[PDB]
């Protein structure tokens, strides 16, 4: 096999984000529609479905006296909350019987499932699924029914694919389509959910200052609370709260929080979320959810009491808690109750009882832990803070809270005044005197949980860094990323095999709780499986499938990160605060799992014994948005945590060469921790920040540009590159230098882990503060005084750094940073008042001609509420520019009078280093005041860079469409007789023909400030138009044969053969076929669709020909609409809901652009047919013949042709195509033509060498409909195709028929030889009261009976009786069509199809009972035999399979009279001659009837 890459070629850029997903509220949308319900238990009830999401509920309409109601009612719940509290919001799909405002309704049943279960779906919805309604009152009660519904969760920027909303005619099994996730059994059993609540320790002051705590625990909408331990900082409850809910629970979390029992203003202290998935596994391999008895750590607001607490929401767990509040002993046990046992009390009510007490030894030995801190630097402090001195306080648990009051331990650095770095930032002058802290704490000795989780996160971090390396190597396009992913999977397999030896060495301890046995075995099983799952993915991954298998590796990473989270906390997280003369400012959080010390590296924490760069941020809501862009502090702390009996080597991670200054209590004790360090090893370093060019920056000015300049932060110094004016892609070309910086430590320690550089990009304004486009972080290429400035690592080439303005990306930044150590010879050891970046670091430039096809401008919006009059497009690239011609009037002709004009500009040699090209439209008035109208920047030019080459009379259009749709279904089946077809396309026509942008690319135009997440706007409020055109970027011109593709005209450029620019009148001919899965637009759950079409200035609607009460309509209409291209090009085909009173409501609309369809070489104006004909349903609809089609494409293609020998062959270019020679019309004679073979040539037009293209066939495109009222959701699927024909060719013919019926008359004359039933009273032989029963479609509507011929002794009867059967017919398929309801619960009319056979039966009439069956015959209307002249001529061959009796179709003969037999089974189960009948079959049309 191919080898593996085992080194890191990339990932020097740190992906630090100041605004993670936690805590940020983002607009969530849940949408729920109850379709129907079935089998609901009750007697003459009136069900109304009540759907609640959290704190509010919304009912349906009341249905009368049915156990199977139908609603189809849509509900929209919008909530602007955080994702974690959105996922914990519960849905409460219920059914209420007889709901009214006077008396409370009686609940039939209910069902519960939170939002996060719905969001865990592969496309975040459940489709047409049936919710079992259990009984929340009785656990012994049975199933109370099912409720079909759709539950969908869609967020901001999320788009949803909607499946087919099939009706109940396509019958569905309930038990195979339930509203459950995968793996849960349908008969979910009851289970007691105990939570055992023992004791809390370390509560803060809350009254002024005492605490009166209790615990309130929420689960699945239920709650229970414990007693109140008044005036106790360390309360003892010893109470357990028992729930009773369905297992496994679909609300997969628990809230456990402490609350003050204030008499007026009771409020939380801290909240822990028991994530119920982490403590359980399903199936017989899994185990029941259990936790504890072990402590848990809870976080909230600051412990210092504020009356108007701005962080009160953090006490309730709504964000990332900023300080340690309390620690609570917790437990959980799940026991399945056997509901069939009658002695157990059947209430589901939450109860509180006294728990079984446990000692404190069961949670672990109370060992004492040591945390050591060292503040090496404190830079980038906000200027608004440092008018007073700043301290830093480190607090873990209650330890470190010496200032508030709740070995003499020290927790605060000494106060000092900050020194000014620049206009935005301070820095503390620590220099060589680093302040330090040391704390002593007492925690349980559950280090094994954190050690196993450290091994898990070590494997996960190696895997994630490897996947980021593979992604970056694919993005950079390095050599063979397949080898790199194979090496990553090898390292993942080695890590998974490494866990099996490291997490199993200390199983004999008595502190080993119940959960960390089952969970430990669970992750042993998971990593044991992953140990060869990674090796199978190693054999499966190759070069062509690396992107697909990276998703499987991401699944592996997500599973590993699921495994690494430890639900049983032992040590709380360590908090680092900053206070300005004790007033709290900013905070940070380090997990104590990452600071724990152990002797082998994988179970060692990743942040232990090393200096980590840590950015403080404002607490809570202040850290989001505009208030917290500026960094509150950039620290680099040293932190160590572990046993005090493991304190032998906790200084060795620090930079070397420091004197250790200890306090007065440690004089003479060499093992005493230091109060401060004083460094003595001064090392000198110099940062040259080579920057070339930022790109795609945020727009922070009203003109839509910015004035960018970058502040560079390193240690304690700051410098700026110069301000460039009105550009979002600056070329600064400026190297900054920080000279004679003083680092501390030894040289080789910072080589492989260098310090950080913060690069904040600012928008210079006229006065006051500069605006902010974000920041990026960097790690430099550090060289020493002795190593050579040599290849491959030196000189540093530039790389892109991703800038983030908080959450959203806001540009890239081309830079290379280097730390050069000033050595023994001074600066002479370093190879080299604004300086440019030096050679070898800047990209080498070769000249490129940029040729722009200035086609036109569409949909231009107002500038200063005035319409665009004279637009001119300036295009800029790397400083050079070309100016287009002026549009003289945008209203009449929005196009330029000169096609191609070009300009020369040096560009980088490799295409990855290219700047974005800057198109820009301005309003060019007199006297040079060119205000901006729009601009588009974000593009890559490798898309545009040229590189040189090397009965049959009843057939209709619907028969064609159904033949094509079964061809499409069989093509789906193979991938997962004489009727010609067409290519049905199941998507938009754009996605199979690259939006018809083969030469006419479309660029979207923007103007203005880029909107904020709350106070800003979408990109639809920033679009000011669209520029249609093209680009062609190439080097010094190629040799003569390649240069002949441009050499005819410099005003044409390389766009030789582009069609002309003059406006042309054209007719649009829209055919609408049908629509599927429409959204309910009325209160009845359905709508009244009709077509509404807009194109430029013309609006045509068909509200007089609406379709009533249908969600799957068949339109069958054609629309000949006049348009003037290019002004009237924007078509929007829409469906509208007819309303009897008030106003019509929009159903949906789709955007379809017809300029790209007009001007493409794919010919989307008219699809070519698969076969030629001049008559019938397969008529050629295009006015100009296939010979004209290929002469058009031959002169437009610069290709010789056509050439004709005989009519059966056509030669175009170097290839010869064949086909049939003759054409038939309706009269029946033959005549030769060339159009068949010509059409065969366009069907194979891709075989042409130079301008080979995929011409579209005749087709049924299907566009998804979108609604501005509910964007991002697929409203429906509308089938249509568009034809276009210009007016200066000859006009098209009449539009084709695409628009979406008889009566049989039967006369029964006589009977003979019929079997007999009733014994004679006088003579004793049998007899029959013969009468005839007949129906065509069914006995529901077509049941008709004759008079009774009483007392027949041989079968002879005389009736002369008439039936009538009206019906609809499909002559192509021999199917009778009727319209009827599906069931009693339906509220629509549905079309069905049956075989076209008439049923005739003979019966015996009784005056005291039901009729008795005698015989029957089923007669096909196209194949029933001719009747015999007499009764005795009728034999067995008239009903059996013998061919001796001729067969007659009633649609050709129209009247057949004679005799027929009838058959029924006797006692020997064989069919015999049970009777005969004389009949007459007659046919009339619907017009004759
Ligand atoms: Ca109180
Ligand atoms: Ca500004
Ligand atoms: Ca500005
Ligand atoms: Ca309506
Ligand atoms: Ca309506
Ligand atoms: Ca009878
Ligand atoms: Ca009878």
DSSP string, 1385-1443: T--S-EEEEEE-EEEEEEEE--SSS--EEEEEEEEETTTEEPPBSSSTT--GGGTSS-T
For ligand 5, the distance from its centroid to the CA atom of residue 1458, given in whole angstroms, is 54
CA atoms within 13 A on the CB side of 1481: 27
For ligand 6, the distance from its centroid to the CA atom of residue 1328, given in whole angstroms, is 7
293 cis-preceded (ω within 30 degrees of 0): yes
CATH code of the domain occupying 1064-1162+1262-1286: 2.60.40.150
For ligand 6, the distance from its centroid to the CA atom of residue 1340, given in whole angstroms, is 24
Q: What is the CA radius of gyration of the chain?
A: 41
Instruction: Give the number of other Cβ atoms within 10 Å of residue 1036's Cβ.
Output: 8
Contact (CB, 8 A) for 1267 and 1177 = no
Contact (CB, 8 A) for 115 and 75 = no
Determine the Cα–Cα distance for residues 707 and 721; give it in Å rounded to an integer: 12
For ligand 1, the distance from its centroid to the CA atom of residue 230, given in whole angstroms, is 8
Q: Does domain 846-948+1000-1043 have CATH number 3.30.499.10?
A: no
Ligand number, closest to the Cα atom of 1139: 5
Determine the Cα–Cα distance for residues 72 and 1164; give it in Å rounded to an integer: 39
Determine the Cα–Cα distance for residues 326 and 572; give it in Å rounded to an integer: 10
For ligand 1, the distance from its centroid to the CA atom of residue 260, given in whole angstroms, is 5
Ligand number, closest to the Cα atom of 706: 3
Q: Which residues surround ligand 7, an ion (CB under 5 A)?
A: 1318, 1329, 1404, 1406
Q: What sign does the CA torsion over 100, 101, 102, 104 have?
A: positive
Angle value at C-alpha 731, between 729 and 734, nearest 5 degrees = 140
Give the DSSP H or E segment for 1264. strand 1259-1265
Determine the Cα–Cα distance for residues 1434 and 1428; give it in Å rounded to an integer: 6
1202 cis-preceded (ω within 30 degrees of 0): yes
Q: Do domains 1-187 and 189-363 have the same CATH topology?
A: yes
What CATH fold (topology level) applies to the domain 447-564? Methane Monooxygenase Hydroxylase; Chain G, domain 1 (1.20.58)
Q: Domain 1168-1255 has what CATH class?
A: alpha beta
Ligand number, closest to the Cα atom of 1140: 5
The candidate with the shortest Cα–Cα distance to 301, out of 289, 290, 291, 311, is 311
For ligand 6, the distance from its centroid to the CA atom of residue 522, given in whole angstroms, is 74
Ligand number, closest to the Cα atom of 1142: 4
Q: Does domain 1-187 have CATH number 2.60.40.150?
A: yes
For ligand 1, the distance from its centroid to the CA atom of residue 206, given in whole angstroms, is 7
- Sketch the domain layout of the chain as residue ranges: 1-187, 189-363, 367-446+571-679, 447-564, 682-829, 846-948+1000-1043, 1064-1162+1262-1286, 1168-1255, 1302-1485
For ligand 4, the distance from its centroid to the CA atom of residue 1013, given in whole angstroms, is 33
Determine the Cα–Cα distance for residues 325 and 257; give it in Å rounded to an integer: 11
Quickly list DSSP for 1007-1058. Answer: -SPPPPTTTS--TTTTEEEEEEEEEEEE-SPPPHHHHTTTTT-TTTTT-TTP
Task: List helix spans (H) across 447-590.
Answer: 447-476, 481-502, 515-540, 546-564
For ligand 6, the distance from its centroid to the CA atom of residue 1406, given in whole angstroms, is 5
Phi-psi region of 811 (alpha: psi -120 to 50; beta: other; left: phi over 0): left
What CATH fold (topology level) applies to the domain 682-829? Immunoglobulin-like (2.60.40)
For ligand 6, the distance from its centroid to the CA atom of residue 1439, given in whole angstroms, is 26
For ligand 7, the distance from its centroid to the CA atom of residue 1354, given in whole angstroms, is 14
For ligand 4, the distance from its centroid to the CA atom of residue 36, given in whole angstroms, is 20
Cα dihedral 1184, 1185, 1189, 1192 in deg (nearest 10): -60
For ligand 2, the distance from its centroid to the CA atom of residue 708, given in whole angstroms, is 10
Q: Domain 189-363 has what CATH class?
A: mainly beta
The candidate with the shortest Cα–Cα distance to 1253, out of 1328, 1203, 1189, 1180, is 1189
Which of the following CATH numbers is that of domain 1302-1485: 1.10.10.10, 3.90.550.10, 2.60.40.150, 3.40.50.300?
2.60.40.150
Determine the Cα–Cα distance for residues 715 and 376; give it in Å rounded to an integer: 10
For ligand 2, the distance from its centroid to the CA atom of residue 381, given in whole angstroms, is 23
What CATH fold (topology level) applies to the domain 367-446+571-679? Immunoglobulin-like (2.60.40)
For ligand 5, the distance from its centroid to the CA atom of residue 1384, given in whole angstroms, is 23
For ligand 3, the distance from its centroid to the CA atom of residue 700, given in whole angstroms, is 7
- Write the CB contacts of 1054 (distance below 8 Å, at least 6 apart in sequence): 851, 946, 1032, 1034, 1045, 1046
Resolution in A: 2.9
How many angstroms separate the most distant Cα atoms in the chain? Answer: 143
Ligand number, closest to the Cα atom of 258: 1
What 3-state DSSP class applies to 728? Answer: coil
Burial class (CB in 10 A: 0-12, 13-18, 19+), 861: middle
1294 cis-preceded (ω within 30 degrees of 0): no
DSSP state of 178: B
What 3-state DSSP class applies to 406? Answer: coil
For ligand 1, the distance from its centroid to the CA atom of residue 259, given in whole angstroms, is 9
Instruction: Give the number of other Cβ atoms within 10 Å of residue 360's Cβ.
Output: 15
């Amino acid at each position: 096999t191919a080898l593996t890459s085992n080194v890191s070629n990339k990932r020097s850029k740190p992906d630090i984000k100041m605004e993670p997903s936690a805590g940020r509220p983002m607009d969530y949308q849940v949408s729920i529609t109850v379709i129907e319900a079935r089998q609901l238990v009750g007697l003459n009830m009136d069900p109304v479905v009540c759907v609640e999401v959290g704190d509010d509920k919304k009912y349906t309409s009341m249905k009368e006296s049915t156990n199977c109601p139908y609603y189809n009612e849509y509900f929209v719940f919008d909530f602007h909350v955080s994702p974690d509290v959105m996922f914990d919001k519960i849905i409460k799909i219920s059914v209420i019987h007889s709901k009214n405002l006077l008396r409370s309704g009686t609940l039939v049943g209910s069902f519960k499932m939170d939002v996060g279960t719905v969001y865990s779906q592969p496309e975040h919805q459940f489709h047409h699924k049936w919710a079992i309604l259990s009984d929340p009152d009785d656990i012994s009660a049975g199933l109370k029914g099912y409720v079909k519904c759709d539950v969908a969760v869609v967020g901001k920027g999320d788009n949803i694919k909607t499946p087919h909303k099939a009706n109940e005619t396509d019958e569905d099994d309930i038990e195979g389509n339930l509203l459950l996730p995968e793996g849960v059994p349908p008969e979910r059993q009851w289970a007691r959910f105990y939570v055992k609540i023992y004791r809390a320790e370390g509560l803060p002051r809350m009254n002024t200052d005492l605490v009166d705590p209790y615990v309130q625990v929420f689960f699945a909408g239920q709650k229970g609370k414990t007693s109140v331990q008044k005036s106790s900082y360390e309360p003892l409850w010893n109470e357990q709260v028992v729930f009773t809910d369905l297992f496994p629970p679909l609300c997969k979390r628990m809230k456990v929080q402490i609350r003050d029992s204030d008499k007026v203003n009771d409020v939380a202290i801290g909240t822990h979320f028991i994530d119920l998935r982490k403590i359980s596994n399903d199936g017989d391999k899994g185990f029941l959810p259990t936790l504890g008895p072990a402590w848990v750590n809870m976080y909230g607001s600051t412990r210092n009491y504020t009356l108007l607490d701005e962080h009160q929401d953090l006490n309730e767990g709504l964000g990332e808690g900023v300080s340690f509040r309390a620690r609570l002993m917790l437990g959980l046990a799940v026991e399945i109750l056997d509901t069939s046992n009658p002695e157990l009390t059947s209430s589901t009510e939450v109860q509180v009882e006294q728990a079984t007490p446990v000692s404190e030894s069961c949670t672990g030995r109370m060992e004492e832990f040591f945390l050591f801190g060292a503040f090496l630097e404190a830079s980038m402090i906000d200027r608004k803070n440092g008018d007073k001195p700043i301290t830093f306080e480190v607090t873990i648990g209650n330890y470190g809270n010496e200032v508030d009051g709740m070995l003499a331990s020290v927790s605060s650095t000494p106060p000092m005044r900050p020194q000014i770095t620049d206009r935005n930032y301070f820095h503390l002058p620590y220099l060589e005197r680093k302040p330090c802290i040391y704390i002593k704490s007492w925690w349980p000795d559950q280090r094994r949980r954190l050690y196993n989780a450290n091994i898990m996160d070590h494997i996960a971090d190696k895997l994630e860094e490897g996947l980021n390396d593979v992604q970056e190597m694919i993005k950079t396009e390095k050599s063979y990323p397949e080898r790199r992913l194979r090496g990553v999977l090898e390292e993942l397999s080695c890590g998974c095999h490494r866990f099996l030896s490291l997490s199993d060495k200390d199983q004999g301890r008595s502190s080993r709780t119940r959960l960390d046995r089952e969970r430990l075995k669970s992750c042993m099983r998971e990593l044991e499986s992953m140990g060869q799952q990674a090796k199978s993915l190693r054999a499966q991954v190759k070069r062509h499938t690396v992107r697909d298998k990276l998703r499987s590796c991401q699944n592996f990473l997500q599973k590993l990160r699921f495994l690494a989270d430890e639900p049983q906390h032992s040590i709380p997280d360590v908090f680092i605060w900053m206070m300005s003369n004790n007033k709290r400012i900013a905070y940070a959080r380090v997990p104590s799992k990452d600071l724990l010390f152990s002797i082998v590296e994988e179970e060692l924490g990743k942040d232990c014994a090393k200096v980590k760069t840590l950015f403080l941020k404002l607490p809570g809501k202040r850290g989001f948005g505009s208030a917290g862009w500026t960094v509150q502090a950039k620290l680099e702390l040293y932190l160590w945590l572990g046993l005090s009996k493991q304190r032998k080597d906790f200084l060795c991670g620090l930079p070397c060469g420091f004197e250790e200054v200890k306090a007065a209590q440690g004089l003479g004790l060499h093992s005493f921790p230091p109060i401060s360090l004083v460094y003595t090893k001064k090392q000198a370093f110099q940062l040259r920040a080579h920057m070339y060019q930022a790109r795609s920056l945020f727009a922070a000015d009203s003109s839509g540009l910015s004035d960018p300049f970058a502040r560079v932060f390193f240690i304690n110094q700051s410098q700026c590159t110069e301000v460039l004016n009105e550009t979002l892609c600056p070329t600064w070309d400026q190297m900054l230098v920080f000279d004679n910086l003083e680092l501390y430590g030894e040289a080789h320690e910072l080589r492989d882990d260098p310090p950080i550089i913060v690069i904040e990009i600012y928008d210079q304004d006229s006065m006051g503060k500069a605006d902010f486009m974000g920041r990026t972080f960097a790690k430099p290429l550090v060289k020493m005084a002795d190593e050579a400035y040599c290849p491959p690592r030196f000189p540093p080439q530039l790389e892109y750094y991703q800038i983030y303005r908080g959450s959203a990306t806001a540009g890239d930044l081309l830079a290379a940073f280097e730390l050069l150590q000033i050595g023994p010879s001074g600066k002479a050891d370093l190879p080299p008042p604004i300086m440019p970046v030096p050679v070898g670091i800047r990209p080498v430039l070769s000249k490129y001609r940029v040729e722009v096809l200035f086609w036109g401008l569409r949909d231009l919006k107002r500038v200063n509420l005035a319409q665009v009059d004279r637009p001119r497009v300036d295009i800029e690239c790397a400083g050079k520019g070309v100016q287009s011609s002026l549009i003289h009037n945008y209203k009449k002709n929005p196009n330029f009078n000169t096609l191609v004009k070009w300009f020369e500009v040096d560009l980088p040699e490799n295409e990855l280093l290219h700047p974005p090209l800057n198109i820009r439209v301005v309003d060019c008035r007199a006297f040079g005041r060119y205000t901006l109208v729009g601009s588009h920047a974000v593009s890559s030019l490798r898309r545009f860079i040229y590189r040189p080459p090397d009965d049959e009379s009843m057939l209709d259009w619907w028969s064609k469409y159904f033949a094509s749709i079964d061809t499409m279904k069989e093509q789906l089946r193979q991938h997962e007789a004489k009727i010609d077809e067409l290519k049905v396309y199941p998507k938009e026509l754009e996605s199979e023909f690259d939006s018809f942008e083969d030469w006419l690319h479309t660029f979207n135009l923007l103007r203005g400030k880029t909107g904020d997440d709350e106070d800003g706007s979408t990109e639809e409020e920033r679009i000011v138009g669209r520029f249609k055109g093209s680009l062609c970027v190439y080097k010094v011109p190629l040799p003569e044969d390649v240069s002949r593709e441009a050499g005819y005209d410099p005003t044409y450029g390389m766009f030789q053969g582009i069609p002309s620019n003059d406006p042309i009148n054209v007719l649009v001919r829209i055919y609408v076929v049908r629509a599927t899965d429409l959204h309910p637009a009325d209160i009845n759950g359905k709508a009244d669709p009709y077509i509404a079409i807009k194109l430029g200035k013309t609006d045509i609607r068909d509200k007089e020909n609406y379709i009533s009460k249908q969600l799957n309509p068949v339109f069958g209409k054609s629309f000949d609409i006049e348009a003037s291209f290019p002004m009237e090009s924007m078509l929007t085909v829409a469906v509208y809901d007819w309303d009897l009173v008030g106003t019509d409501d929009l159903i949906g609309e789709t955007k379809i652009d017809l300029e790209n369809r007009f001007y493409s070489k794919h010919r989307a104006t008219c699809g070519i047919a698969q076969t030629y004909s001049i008559h019938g349903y397969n008529i050629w609809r295009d006015p100009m013949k296939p010979s004209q089609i290929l002469t058009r494409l031959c002169k437009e293609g610069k290709v010789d042709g056509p050439h004709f020998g005989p009519h059966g062959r056509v030669r175009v270019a170097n290839r010869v195509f064949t086909g049939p020679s003759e054409i038939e019309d309706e009269n029946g004679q033959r005549k030769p033509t060339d159009e068949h073979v010509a059409l065969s040539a366009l069907r194979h037009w891709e075989d042409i060498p130079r301008v080979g293209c995929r011409l579209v066939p005749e087709h049924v495109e299907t566009r998804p409909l979108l609604n501005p009222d509910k964007p991002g959701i697929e409203q429906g699927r509308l089938e249509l195709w568009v034809d276009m024909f210009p007016m200066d060719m000859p006009a098209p013919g009449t539009p084709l028929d695409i628009s979406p019926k008889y009566e049989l008359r039967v006369i029964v004359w006589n009977t003979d030889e019929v079997v007999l039933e009733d014994d004679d009273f006088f003579t004793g032989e049998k007899s029959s009261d013969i009468f005839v029963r007949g129906w065509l479609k069914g006995q529901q509507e077509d049941k008709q009976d004759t008079d009774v011929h009483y007392h027949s002794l041989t079968g002879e009867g005389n009736f002369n009786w008439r039936y009538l059967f009206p019906f609809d017919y499909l002559a192509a398929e021999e199917k009778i069509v009727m319209s009827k309801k599906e069931s009693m619960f339906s509220w629509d009319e549905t079309e069905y199809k049956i075989p076209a056979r008439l049923t005739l039966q003979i019966w015996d009439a009784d005056h005291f009972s039901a009729d008795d069956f005698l015989g029957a015959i089923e007669l096909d209307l196209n194949r029933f035999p001719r009747g015999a002249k007499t009764a005795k001529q009728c034999t067995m061959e008239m009903a059996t399979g013998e061919v001796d009796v001729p067969l007659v179709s009633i649609f050709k003969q129209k009247r057949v009279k004679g005799w027929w037999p009838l058959l029924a089974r006797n006692e020997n189960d064989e069919f015999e001659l049970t009777g005969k009948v004389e009949a007459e079959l007659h046919l009339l049309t619907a017009e004759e009837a």
